[PDB]
Design a protein around this ligand. Structure first.
Ligand SMILES: [Mg+2]
Ligand SMILES: [Mg+2]
Ligand SMILES: [Mg+2]
Ligand SMILES: [Mg+2]
Ligand SMILES: [Mg+2]
Ligand SMILES: [Mg+2]
Ligand SMILES: [Mg+2]
Lengths: 128, 106, 225, 125, 187
RNA sequence: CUGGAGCGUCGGGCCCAUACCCGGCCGUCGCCGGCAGUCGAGAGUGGACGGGAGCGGCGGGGGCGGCGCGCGCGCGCGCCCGCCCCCGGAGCCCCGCGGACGCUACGCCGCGACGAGUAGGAGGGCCGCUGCGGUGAGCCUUGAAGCCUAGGGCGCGGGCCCG
RNA sequence: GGGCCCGGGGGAGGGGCCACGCGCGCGUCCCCCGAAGAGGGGGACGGCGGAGCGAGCGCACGGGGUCGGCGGCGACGUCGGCUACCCACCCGACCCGUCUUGAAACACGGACCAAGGAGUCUAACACGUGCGCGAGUCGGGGGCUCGCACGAAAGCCGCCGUG
């Protein structure tokens, strides 16, 4: 029961699965990162039947719920304390995310200064 | 031979020939090119002369009926639907037609 | 100032409740005329055949002036000259339709694309159905739905056409303005024919679906609206 | 002129922070940190600011004086208000409006005042 | 299942100045406003010019600006050039003018003021006549660049005279096969 | 498979494509598009100001009607005469006196249309790698880079953020 | 059958009407009384004055894109987790790169994994674009100013026009 969002819509995601690269399974030399196949006789680039899907634009998220966390707030990579009072107003729409490489001492000081002015933090119970 | 059958307007007149501009299509782009042709290979095309007779009549039918103000059909107009009428057979039924039996003539 | 403006605007307020009344009533009574005409035209074509039949005589009704053309085959593998016509009738996408005005030049353009289209003489109810349910008007080069008739007058008011019902006069009784009436109508986009066709390839006369079907096209417009 | 600076500062500012598909401005005495034209502190010549009092309790109201700018030492006057969250709000209310002092910030100034006070009271269970 | 050519459906015209100079971007902010609002097509042309390139809004000489203002009737109006006013050393009787321009070369600036004239900029022109009332729009000759000479049919095609690119003109540089009838042929 | 699941000529009914229809979203193009503080929806003027006067009006088409009429002109109040007044307040569906939350003006917004692709071109890439001039009162022995992770997620994706 | 046909007229209480007041003295027209006229009465029609006229709450709505002023079970070994781990199934599905009219090919390269790895610089044109100045405009070489920290920078020179 922490910091409801302003508006919690119905988030729909047209495709939830990743887009692995063609043949990224057979070979280990190939990462799962997408690369648009450009073979002449390649069977994915000519969008054949029952083949892995090529990402295109009409496949993309709703303009309202884009970049939206499952709770409702967009993340903000807050890096220290002074960069938190930026969110003092845009707070019921989006929230604070403490940077990985923040020391454990001030990683605390960022937490309870946020709980002061009601800025939900997604990684608030982190280092300890 | 590529101009044989083609029309074009006249732009020059020498003693027994006539300079004349026609269009000649070549792989696409149409080139308006001017040739010199002696008169024996030339006629007056009445293609123009249907109009200038629709014109002399249109200009006339507009100067008149202007003292009246009644608007007249000046434009041509394509062949309309044939305008429901009657047919009258007088004292005969129509003639009965039957497809005729085949027979090999040779 | 205040109560000299207050009145000045209220007058302009009511001066509309006059006009939008008079404009509402004019439409109402123009719609009574088009009730009397469309009834007299039906009857007086029966009036006549009854009168020739009494004598030993015959009737040839008027050659239909209005024909509603649907395209029935899609777009690939289509001739050059065919493809030019079909974009002059505005049957661009497959399976849409337009009201063409019958005419020596028009008829001789349907002969040349006959294996692609299916045209015929529409009746009144067929004209209504198309215009109301699937009638969109071309305004500022947009397919804008004909939801209110201040959109029809806003485009056609210079021709005495002021309402949804006045459009249908100029579409039935071909009339002086068929050129502007049936070019602000965006091509009707009809669904597939519920129940199926007979044979998209062959002509109606040999059991198919193409070409002209006089007056039988109305069955094709029900199942395709 | 204001419109001039804003074309030098739209990007390329030491207070502009662009990450995570948003943009923001950490400049002093701008309400809601918007990298904007209305809601900017330096560019303008009449600006309203609202930040917590340094004591822990209260609200301080920065008003640019406009008497003479390019005088940053005094061009820029503050004041303090420690009151009851309803007069507090109605002080910045009467101070921005019925003074015809940038009645764009008028509401954004209040929503920043209120959100300041919510941040100085018993924090949590 | 539609059959239009999408070849040239996207219209290629400039809708913003490709340049970064904040000043031009500012009075573009002004006539991005006037153009939408006032019925005057005037600024719709002024706006549609503030986009164009240096190579496309050429400089207007000062003398070509006289003989276009000397014509009977356009007395008392203001010359309006989306461009620069250059000087013309081959002209001396400078009548009094009211000019607007983006730039005016410093020499032409003193010929105009000394003759009891006035020069404005495109923001005072917005306050003089926001509708563009009582104005004259002008431009330099866009077919003036020496580039436009190398354009055309071709050099060497029949009676189509077009300057060829030659590293340096002279006797022995392109007067041979194709130019003198004596040496090969000529066109 | 054999009065058929065979061959002709025909019915109805049904089945299904990324085709067509309606709807949802994503982008591209178009709109001489709207929005930097404004009335106004076939818009078919608005405003002084003077003289005279008033139930007057503008006594014009079965047109079916568009340009003129029945929510008011003048009116209630002050009492035939005066007014018919001021938004620091009319109380607001129009507000022209001051303008959005919205207005990063290369921002935001409303309409439509449309989106196959090699060779190739162009555009956009808060896609990524190393280094410099700036800048982040940036981060860091309370643990940086790298590496590892059936840990939580964001982006159509390049990739990215967190545990 | 059409002239919303003409209509002087009669029914005989024929049906149906987005008609609209009577008072009264208009434009026109029709009818009737009237002299054919003046004028009157009635009607059509127009129009807007010889009238017309003039306001309040409801359902709504088969009315500019859905809301309920409706409700019910669940809770320390049971709720929620799209995507990614393993497994299962139904449908789909031939191995990539390449030259090629045509590649899953009985065409060739490829066991696997790491790191390395290929449109660069210079000069010369050309057009497009940005910026300074504009019948001019430079830029080099020199010169005048430093041991450079930043400098082998920056600044300046009838040199700036010898060219
Ligand atoms: Mg085919
Ligand atoms: Mg075939
Ligand atoms: Mg594409
Ligand atoms: Mg490193
Ligand atoms: Mg071969
Ligand atoms: Mg083989
Ligand atoms: Mg080989």
């Amino acid at each position: 029961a922490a910091l409801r969002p302003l508006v919690k819509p119905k988030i729909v995601k047209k495709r939830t699965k990743k887009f692995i690269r063609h043949q990224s399974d057979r070979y280990v030399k190939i990462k799962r990162n997408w690369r648009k196949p450009r073979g002449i006789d390649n069977r994915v680039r000519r969008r054949f039947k029952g083949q892995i899907l090529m990402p295109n634009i009409g496949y993309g998220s709703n303009k309202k719920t884009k970049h939206m966390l499952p709770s409702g707030f967009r993340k903000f990579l807050v890096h220290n304390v002074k960069e938190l009072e930026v969110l003092l107003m845009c707070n019921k729409s989006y929230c604070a995310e403490i940077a990985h490489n923040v020391s454990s001492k001030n990683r605390k000081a960022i937490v309870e200064r946020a709980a002061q002015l009601a800025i939900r933090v997604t990684n608030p119970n982190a280092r300890l | 031979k590529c101009y044989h059958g083609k029309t074009g307007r006249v732009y020059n007149v020498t003693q027994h020939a006539v300079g004349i501009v026609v269009n000649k299509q070549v792989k696409g782009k149409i080139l308006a090119k001017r040739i010199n042709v002696r008169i024996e290979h030339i006629k007056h095309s009445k293609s123009r002369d249907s109009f200038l007779k629709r014109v002399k009549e249109n200009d006339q039918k507009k100067k008149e009926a202007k003292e009246k103000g009644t608007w007249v059909q000046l434009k041509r107009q394509p062949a309309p639907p044939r305008e429901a009428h009657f047919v009258r057979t007088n004292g005969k039924e129509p003639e009965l037609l039957e497809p005729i039996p085949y027979e090999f003539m040779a | 100032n205040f109560a000299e403006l207050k009145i000045k605007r209220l007058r302009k307020k009511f001066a509309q409740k006059m006009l939008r009344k008079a404009r509402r009533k004019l439409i109402y009574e123009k719609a009574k005329h088009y009730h009397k005409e469309y009834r007299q035209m039906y009857r007086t074509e029966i009036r006549m055949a009854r009168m020739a039949r009494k004598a030993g005589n015959f009737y040839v009704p008027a050659e239909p002036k209005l024909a509603f053309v649907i395209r029935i085959r899609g777009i690939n593998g289509v001739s050059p000259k065919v493809r030019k016509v079909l974009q002059l009738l505005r049957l661009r996408q497959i399976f849409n339709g337009t009201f063409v005005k019958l005419n020596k030049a028009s008829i001789n353009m349907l002969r040349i694309v006959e294996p692609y289209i299916a045209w015929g003489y529409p009746n009144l109810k067929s004209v209504n159905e198309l215009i109301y349910k699937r009638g969109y008007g071309k305004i500022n080069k947009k397919r804008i739905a004909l939801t209110d008739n201040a959109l029809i007058a806003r485009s056609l008011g210079k021709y005495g056409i002021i309402c949804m019902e006045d459009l249908i006069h100029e579409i039935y009784t071909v009339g002086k303005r068929f050129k502007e009436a049936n070019n602000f109508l965006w091509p009707f986009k009809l669904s597939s024919p519920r129940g199926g066709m007979k044979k998209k390839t062959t002509h109606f006369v040999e059991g198919g679906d193409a070409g002209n079907r006089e007056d039988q096209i109305n069955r094709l417009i029900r199942r395709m609206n | 002129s204001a419109h001039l600076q804003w074309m030098v500062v739209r990007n390329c500012s030491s207070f502009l922070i662009k990450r995570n598909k948003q943009t923001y401005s950490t400049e002093p005495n701008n309400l809601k940190a918007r990298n904007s034209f209305r809601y900017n502190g330096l560019i303008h010549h009449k600006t309203v600011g609202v930040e917590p009092a340094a004591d822990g309790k209260g609200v301080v109201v920065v008003i640019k004086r406009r008497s003479g700018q390019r005088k940053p030492a005094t061009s820029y006057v503050r004041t303090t208000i420690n009151k009851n969250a309803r007069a507090t709000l109605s002080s910045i209310r009467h101070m921005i409006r019925k003074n015809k002092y940038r009645p764009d910030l008028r509401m954004a100034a209040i929503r920043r005042a209120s959100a300041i006070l919510r941040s100085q009271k018993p924090v949590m269970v | 299942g539609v059959d239009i050519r999408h070849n040239k459906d996207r219209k290629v015209r400039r809708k913003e100045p490709k340049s970064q100079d904040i000043y031009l971007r500012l009075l573009v902010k002004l006539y991005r406003f006037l153009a939408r609002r006032t019925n005057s097509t005037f600024n719709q042309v002024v706006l549609k010019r503030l986009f164009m390139s240096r190579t496309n809004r050429p400089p207007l000489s000062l003398s070509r600006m006289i003989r276009k203002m000397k014509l009977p009737g356009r007395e008392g109006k203001t010359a309006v050039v989306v461009g620069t006013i250059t000087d013309d050393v081959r002209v001396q009787e400078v009548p009094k003018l009211k000019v607007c321009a983006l730039r005016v070369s410093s020499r032409a600036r003193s010929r105009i003021l000394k003759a009891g004239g006035k020069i404005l900029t495109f923001d005072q022109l917005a306050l003089d006549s926001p509708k563009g009332c009582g104005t004259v729009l002008l431009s330099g000759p866009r077919k003036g660049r020496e580039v436009y000479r190398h354009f055309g049919k071709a050099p060497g095609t029949p009676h189509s005279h077009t300057k060829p690119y030659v590293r340096s003109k002279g006797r022995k540089f392109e007067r041979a096969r194709g130019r003198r009838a004596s040496r090969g042929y000529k066109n």
